[PDB]
Each structure stands twice: as structure tokens, then as C-alpha cells.
Amino acid sequence: QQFGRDIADTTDAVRDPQTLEILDITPCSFGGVSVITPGTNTSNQVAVLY
Amino acid sequence: QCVNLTTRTQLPPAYTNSFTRGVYYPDKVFRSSVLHSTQDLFLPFFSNVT
Ligand SMILES: *[C@@H]1O[C@H](CO)[C@@H](O)[C@H](O)[C@H]1NC(C)=O
Q: Which residues does the record list as glycosylated (chain A)?
């Protein structure tokens, strides 16, 4: 075996082609941006939710 | 350099079953906890074999 797949059909596993080393996937970071703010007539302060 | 084996008695071979045989790994892709389906040359279950 050289490759691998998960339940979502994504190449989450791979084999090093130079030695017997196997590696997997664990994300470095992620983020979903969303800004909450009142109306322009009321104020101008903003806040970002990740 | 060969020797002819004329002592073999001629007889038709018998037939048996193939309940849970003929299965093998499809490719070199790792699969874990996934119900993968594919089309490949596979011996049918409960089939007639010699
Ligand atoms: C397989 O086929 C042969 C000849 O057609 C027959 O004699 C034998 O009984 C069969 N075996 C099975 C398990 O059906």
C-alpha cells in the first residue's frame, strides 16, 4: 500500500516513497469569519467571530 | 532431460464449493472503517469449483 482514503473519499493518508514512514492529516489551523455590528446610524463598533 | 510418467491413472476430477474464497485486496489504497464498493475480477460466492 502507498495511499489511503477516509470515509469522505479524501487522501488523508500517504506513505513516504523513500522509507517505511506513514503520515496522516491533522490540521494546522482553521477559521470561519463572521462580523457582528449594529446599524450605521446607531454606531460604528464592530466585532469579528471565528 | 525429462522422464515420462505413464503410471498416472486417468480419472475425472471431483467438484467442490467456493463458499468464502476468491476475495483479495482491490488496490494499494488504505481503507479504514469504510464500506467501499468497486468492480473487479472476483470469484463468486458459493460457486462451483473443481
Ligand atoms: C459442478 O459441476 C459438475 C459438472 O457440471 C457437477 O458434476 C458438480 O456436481 C457441480 N458441483 C456443484 C457443487 O454444483
A: 41
Determine whether the shortest distance from the Cβ of B18 to ligand 1 is under 6 A.
no
Beta strands (DSSP E) in B1-50 are 16-18, 29-31, 47-49
- Resolution given for this structure, in angstroms: 6.0
DSSP A27: -
Single-letter residue type at B49? V
Residue B19's Cβ-count burial label (10 Å; 0-12, 13-18, 19+) is exposed
Q: Which residues contact B19 (CB under 8 A, 6 or more apart)?
A: B45, B46
